[PDB]
Each structure stands twice: as C-alpha cells, then as structure tokens.
Design a protein around this ligand. Structure first.
Ligand SMILES: *CC(=O)N1Cc2ccccc2[C@H](c2ccccc2)C1
Ligand SMILES: *CC(=O)N1Cc2ccccc2[C@H](c2ccccc2)C1
Lengths: 304, 304
C-alpha cells in the first residue's frame, strides 16, 4: 500500500550522460551508440541567444570545437550535424552502456522521468507530465540543458524529452530527441508565454482510483454523471474535456475497484464544485494530474 | 528555477539489488562486496509471522536454502548470520558494481531516496523522510521487502533504510543496514500503531525558503516571532518544536534570501493559523515537510 510520485530507476540513463562544451558553453549530452545528442544552443554565447542564426553560427564550428567528456574520459568527435533544435555529434566510440532505446514524441498528459544533470553528472530524478500547453514543470538550473526525459518498458528506454529553456514564468520547454520542440516554443531568448495550464482530467481520475485502491475513499459519493454533464464542469474549472477514449483507458481501474468511470467523474465533479474542505487524498490537498492510468496500474501492480 | 520532490539517481543502488528466496518467500537483497543483506523474515511463512522465533526458525536453514540471484546469475552462499532483524548472506563473489558506501542510522526529519524493487528488479525511485514517529510514507507491495533507502554524497552511497513491514494504517516500518528497526516496531504480524505523525517544522521552513528562491512569495508578511512564541503555535498544530539548532541549520537559506529565520517562522505561523486560503506554494496546497535544509541547498545549487 501507499502511492508515491515515482520516477523510473535512472541507471540506464545515467550511463548515457556526457558533458558537451562548445567554446565557453557547457551543457549535457546523451551518448547512444556512437552519437551524442545535445541542444544546438551549445554553440551560442548568451549574447547569441537574443536572435541566433544556428546554421550561420554552426559554419564557424568544427568537430574539434565540440568537447565531449564521459566521466573523466574525452570522446573524439568525427562528425556533427544539426537536426531541428539538436546537434548529433558522431564519436569514434560506441557508448558501451547504451541500453535498448527508442525516441518517442509524447502527447500532452503523458508522464515521464527527468534525470536532472549538470556538467554531464546526475543530480537527481523526478517525475513530470507534458502539460496540455506543452510546457513541463521541472527543476532546471543553468547547465541543466540536455538533461533528458524518458519512460522505461522492462529493458527499453523511450527518450521523449531533452531540456532546452525556461520561460520567464519559470516553467520549462524542450524537444523530443529529433530536436522538435513540444508546443510553439523556439530556442531564442524572446517573449514566449505559456497557454492555459489545463488539468489532465484522465490523470486526476486515475489518481482518484489509486486513492480508493490505497484506502482513501471519503470523496466517493452517491452520484453519477454523463460525459457531456461532467464536461460542462471540466470547462468551468479548466479541465481537459473527458472523451470515451479516456473512459476506455480507465476501464481496468474501473474493473479492479468496481467503481464505474462515470461514478468517479461524479466524485471529481463534487470535488471541483465543493473543494477538499481541508481534507487530503493520498497526502495531497489538491487534485494530482501527473499520474497516467498506466502509471497507477504499474505502481499498484509492482511492474519492473 | 522550479522545485521538485527529487530522488538521488538510483544506478549505484540498482547495481546492488538481488533476489533472495528462502523456501517459498522471495524478497530483495542488497549485495555489497561479498555480503547480501536482506530482512530476516525471508525465512518465514506468513504463518510463522504471527509469532516468529527467528533463532529457532534459522536453525532449520542452511547456506544452500538461501537462493540468491543477481539478474539471471545465481550467487553461491558460503555463510549466513543474523544481525538484529537482517540476514547477512556471505557469497563467493564480490559484487563488481559495489559503489563506495556507508551504513548510517538517520534521525527523524532526515530525507532519503527509496529504490522500490520486486524480485531483485527495480520498479521505481521516490523521496521519503523518516517521520518523527519512525514510520515512512512509502509505496511498497508484497515482494518489496529488502528495498533500501539511501543518500548519495558525490560517489558515496549512505544506506539508511531497509523495508520490512506495512502497519495496518498503510505506513511503513524498517531497519537501518545493521537490522535495527527505526522506532519501536518489530518484524511480527501483531498490533503495532504509529504515534502522532508530527510535521517536521525545520523542513517546512526550508521548503518556504525554496519557494521564495523560486518566486512564490505571497505568504511573506510584516511579522516576526520568537522561538518560544512560534513553539506555542507548533504545539497546537502538532509541529516539532523549533530549536536554535534548527535556526542554525537554516542560516545559509536565511543568508541567501535575506529573510531572518524568525521572520519566516512568523510567515509559517500565519499559514498555520490562517491556512492557504485556496492558494498554492511550489504547486502544493499543504505545507511540505520532506525537504531538509540540505535538500533545498542541494537542489537550488545543482550539486552532482
Ligand atoms: C538550460 C541551460 O543550460 N541554459 C543555459 C544556457 C547557456 C548558454 C546558452 C543558452 C542557454 C539556455 C537558453 C536557451 C534559450 C534561451 C535562453 C537560454 C539555458
Ligand atoms: C514487504 C514484504 O515483502 N512482505 C511480504 C512478506 C512475505 C512473507 C513473510 C513476511 C512478509 C513481510 C511481513 C513482515 C512483517 C509482518 C507481516 C509481513 C511483508
């Protein structure tokens, strides 16, 4: 029993973190096979970040300008290319700790673990969600750029995020491992505001199921609702509209608990309309939305 | 910017997790050098757990009854001994992935990372505190016993916890790596109630400092207080009494922010007396107490 915000074990990814230095900028790189992936803004001075022309800036860079260090050992760069907002540094040595991996571009509402690194060295691991506004609420200081987000399925690391920038509101923007930003963000020191940070309704419902499974039940009520009625309430509270797809995904938690998805929706509706009245659910005083249905099933079943 | 509940990177500990099977009970072991550490209740049937005599039960066990598997490879047990509530299984092979380590017994209020494992395989990592009542609020299913809690200082893993049992209230009890329980708990399926779960005042104040550092400031007020006055309020709200030792420990965060510890105490006092009025602090609607001052400085400075 007990339900915790849980990250994947980070070892497989720790084995992939390197330091990339171009001129006087140091950030993190991901070493998979004989390629090191890092944010293209490694080639910028903070001066350059106001309005960089990366193709023009990159012409001034050679293989030998990219200093790549894995622990205390330097990697030889034999090639470099820009793909969208990442650089791919070809090195002469395959990373011997390369796990089985994929690059996936995640949808908003999907959760992943972040291995926060500085100078190619891990500082910590925590769990995030891709927000509906394509920001993440991370913990990232200067030097953390090139830190990656990932899921693990048994033996296969799915890399979904590389950290690139902090908005002036202190939320985070980045790319998939093809260097394409999530959302409308650009790797430039300009005015970029996040849209509405909507609540991930399907994740709140998953987490309500997790609460029932772990003994927190005070918010169960005598009511039910419809998708359309529930969605009127979601709109009012800046919740994502609940679809039948979300209902289908919650089916296993519904089955396990014997609480119909629409009954749990009616519980969530009363919580939105009435608040928690100073009570808590799995040690939270607000409605948690960074556990997916798949996360609740995984943690509640003990998958490894 | 951004402040997250952050675990240590788990790789160094992932390298130490093994499966221990005695008869029909499987749980996790920690392999350091040529010793595997695991909970002594590995030798029990669930029947035995009602009133086990571990010394008597252990007489019926030989080296060859302890099946120790590191991934898919079996370790040869050449010795076994009971130290308090753990078994130490001597194996014929030193763990080649043994990191630099220490065993520390932590004080209540101290935080650590848990690597939740099942069958010697990692499922996830999360951050805990030793509660003032010597429970932890974990996420532990059957098979999770022998999962360990740890801190890392650069290259040295300090192992502070091994998971042993769940109380009927769904909080967690365990031992240090010498097999001594935290608090009054015993490895027996009996009536064991946790004492008052008091709030770790010094950790709330640290986290209030973390909030200021990361832009959340609405709770700063025009007031100050004294240790004695603050402590009257702490008593009323089941907070740990604040000592000058706690004030001294918060000195660096005080210095960095320019907010006197006693002014932040007066802020915490108004939060206790008045609630959050539906507002949040670092995305929490309650006062977080599982970040130590040392945790706030580490995360806010980017230590690796
Ligand atoms: C995440 C990180 O390490 N950054 C520091 C940095 C140093 C030098 C150049 C760029 C950057 C990153 C950045 C990206 C976009 C806009 C401003 C700054 C951030
Ligand atoms: C944590 C764990 O794996 N447990 C399962 C278990 C199986 C067999 C014997 C004992 C246990 C553990 C336990 C400890 C004390 C009281 C009851 C159960 C728990």
């Amino acid at each position: 029993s007990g339900f915790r915000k849980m990250a994947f074990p980070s070892g497989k990814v720790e084995g992939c973190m390197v330091q990339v230095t171009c001129g006087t900028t140091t950030l993190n790189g991901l070493w998979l096979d004989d390629v090191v992936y890092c944010p293209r803004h490694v080639i910028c001075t903070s001066e350059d970040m106001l309005n960089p022309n990366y193709e023009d800036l990159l012409i001034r860079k050679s293989n030998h300008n990219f200093l790549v260090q894995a622990g205390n050992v330097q990697l030889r760069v034999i090639g470099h290319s820009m793909q969208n907002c990442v650089l791919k540094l070809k090195v002469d040595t395959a990373n011997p700790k390369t796990p089985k991996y994929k690059f996936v571009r995640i949808q908003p509402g999907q959760t992943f673990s972040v291995l926060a690194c500085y100078n190619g060295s891990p500082s910590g691991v925590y769990q995030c969600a891709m927000r509906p506004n394509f920001t993440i609420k991370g913990s990232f200081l200067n030097g953390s750029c090139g830190s990656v987000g990932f899921n693990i399925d048994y033996d296969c690391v799915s890399f979904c995020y590389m950290h690139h920038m902090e908005l002036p509101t202190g939320v985070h923007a980045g790319t998939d491992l093809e260097g394409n930003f999530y959302g409308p963000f650009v790797d430039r020191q300009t005015a970029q505001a996040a849209g509405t940070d909507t609540t991930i309704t399907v994740n709140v419902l998953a987490w309500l199921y997790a609460a029932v499974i772990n003994g927190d039940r005070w918010f169960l009520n005598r009511f039910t609702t419809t998708l359309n009625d529930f969605n009127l309430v979601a709109m009012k509270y800046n919740y994502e509209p609940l679809t039948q797809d979300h209902v289908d995904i919650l089916g296993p938690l519904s089955a396990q608990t014997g609480i119909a998805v629409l009954d749990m929706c009616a519980s969530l509706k009363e919580l939105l309309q009435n608040g928690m009245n100073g009570r808590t659910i799995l040690g939270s005083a607000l409605l948690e939305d960074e556990f997916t249905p798949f996360d609740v099933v995984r943690q509640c079943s003990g998958v490894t």
